Design an enzyme around this catalytic site. Sequence first.
Site, PDB file in Angstrom:
ATOM      1  N   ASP A 120       0.802  -1.213   0.000  1.00 11.25           N
ATOM      2  CA  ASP A 120       0.000   0.000   0.000  1.00 11.25           C
ATOM      3  C   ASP A 120       0.860   1.299   0.000  1.00 11.25           C
ATOM      4  O   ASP A 120       0.571   2.235   0.747  1.00 11.25           O
ATOM      5  CB  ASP A 120      -1.026  -0.032   1.165  1.00 11.25           C
ATOM      6  CG  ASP A 120      -2.194   0.925   0.961  1.00 11.25           C
ATOM      7  OD1 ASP A 120      -2.627   1.100  -0.205  1.00 11.25           O
ATOM      8  OD2 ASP A 120      -2.641   1.535   1.956  1.00 11.25           O
ATOM      9  N   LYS A 122       1.876   4.855  -0.935  1.00 10.69           N
ATOM     10  CA  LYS A 122       1.202   6.055  -1.456  1.00 10.69           C
ATOM     11  C   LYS A 122       1.860   7.281  -0.790  1.00 10.69           C
ATOM     12  O   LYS A 122       2.372   7.137   0.320  1.00 10.69           O
ATOM     13  CB  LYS A 122      -0.278   6.065  -1.009  1.00 10.69           C
ATOM     14  CG  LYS A 122      -1.159   4.899  -1.411  1.00 10.69           C
ATOM     15  CD  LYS A 122      -2.521   4.984  -0.729  1.00 10.69           C
ATOM     16  CE  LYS A 122      -2.513   4.655   0.747  1.00 10.69           C
ATOM     17  NZ  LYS A 122      -3.897   4.537   1.283  1.00 10.69           N
ATOM     18  N   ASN A 125       1.363   7.595   3.081  1.00 10.86           N
ATOM     19  CA  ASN A 125       2.109   6.629   3.889  1.00 10.86           C
ATOM     20  C   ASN A 125       3.613   6.943   3.946  1.00 10.86           C
ATOM     21  O   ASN A 125       4.391   6.189   4.546  1.00 10.86           O
ATOM     22  CB  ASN A 125       1.863   5.203   3.368  1.00 10.86           C
ATOM     23  CG  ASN A 125       0.452   4.726   3.568  1.00 10.86           C
ATOM     24  OD1 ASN A 125      -0.321   5.279   4.354  1.00 10.86           O
ATOM     25  ND2 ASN A 125       0.083   3.678   2.870  1.00 10.86           N
ATOM     26  N   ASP A 141       2.356   2.695   7.682  1.00  8.61           N
ATOM     27  CA  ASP A 141       1.150   1.911   7.361  1.00  8.61           C
ATOM     28  C   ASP A 141       1.391   0.521   6.777  1.00  8.61           C
ATOM     29  O   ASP A 141       1.157   0.268   5.585  1.00  8.61           O
ATOM     30  CB  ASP A 141       0.093   2.730   6.572  1.00  8.61           C
ATOM     31  CG  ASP A 141      -1.216   1.989   6.344  1.00  8.61           C
ATOM     32  OD1 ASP A 141      -1.616   1.188   7.237  1.00  8.61           O
ATOM     33  OD2 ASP A 141      -1.814   2.156   5.251  1.00  8.61           O
ATOM     34  N   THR A 158       5.058 -35.733  -6.848  1.00  3.61           N
ATOM     35  CA  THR A 158       4.808 -35.984  -8.271  1.00  3.61           C
ATOM     36  C   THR A 158       3.490 -35.288  -8.655  1.00  3.61           C
ATOM     37  O   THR A 158       2.523 -35.351  -7.882  1.00  3.61           O
ATOM     38  CB  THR A 158       4.873 -37.488  -8.633  1.00  3.61           C
ATOM     39  OG1 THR A 158       4.691 -37.640 -10.043  1.00  3.61           O
ATOM     40  CG2 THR A 158       3.845 -38.347  -7.876  1.00  3.61           C
TER      41      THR A 158
END
Length: 283
Positions: A120, A122, A125, A141, A158
Site C-alpha cells: 500500500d 502512497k 504513507n 502503514d 509428483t
Amino acid sequence: MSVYPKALRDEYIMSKTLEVKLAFERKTCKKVAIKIISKALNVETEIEILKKLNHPCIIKIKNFFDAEDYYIVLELMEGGELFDKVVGNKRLKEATCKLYFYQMLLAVQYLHENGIIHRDLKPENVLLSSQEEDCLIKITDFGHSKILTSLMRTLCGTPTYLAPEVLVSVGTAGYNRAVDCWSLGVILFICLSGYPPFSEHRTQVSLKDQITSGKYNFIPEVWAEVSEKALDLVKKLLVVDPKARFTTEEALRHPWLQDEDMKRKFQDLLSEENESTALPQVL
Ligand SMILES: Cc1ccc2ncnc(N)c2c1
C-alpha cells in the site's frame, strides 16, 4: 462522548489530531504520535513487523495498547505526509524528488530483503521528519503488508493429480514484491510532475485499461522541466510485466540515483538525527 484507556493516560498526555494524534510521553515530556485503529490479525502482524524492523527510513514503534481500540505509539514526524507536498498540482524540485525517492528505495529494498511486501505505498504513507525540504523520510502503514510457500511443498511431490493452473503459476511465482516497485514508480511520477500517471480526468480510457496497457498520461509541457534520466527511471518502474519491471536494486543502480551530492545530504541528515542518541565509542 468517549475516553482514552487508563493504561495510555498513565504514560501519555493526548493532544491535537495529525486516526493519528499528537501526544506527550510523561516520562520524557517529548512529543510522540499515537495511531488509533478502531475494532485484529492485521494489527498483530503490523506490530510484529514494526518491532522486527530496524531501518532509518521505516517508522519505529515506541509503544502499543490493546484496549477498546488499538493504540500504536510511533515517532512524531514533524514534516507530515508527502501527500500534502504534492496535492493540487504542487510539485517538488527534481533534487528533492531524488533525495526522497532514494530513501523510499532504501526502505523498500530493506523490506524486500527481509521478506516483507508493503502492498500500500502512497504519498499519505510517506512521512517527512521536518518542515525543511531537505529531511529524512519514513515509510508507514504496514496494515496491508504481507510476509514472504504452499507452491514449493506442492512441487516436491509428483504432479500426477496436480491441476495445470498450478504448474502455469510457477512461471510468475515469487514476483509479488514487484507491486511495491510499481507504486514507487507512480509516487515518483506524481512527485516529478505534480499530477497522477493514471486518472479518470479528461479521458475516455478507463482507469483499469490505462493501468493494464501501461499507457500513462504524458504531458510534455509539464515534463520538459524534468530531466530525461528521472523520466527514464519512471518508465522502467511503470513496466506492465512484473518480471521485466525494475527491482529496488536496479532502481538504486540507475544513472538518476548516481548523485554524490544527494547521497552526502542523506548521510548528513542521518548523523544529525543520530547525534541526540549517539553513545561514546571504543577508539
Ligand atoms: C503514522 C504517523 C506517524 C507519525 C506522524 N507524525 C505526524 N503526522 C502524521 N500524520 C503522522 C502519522
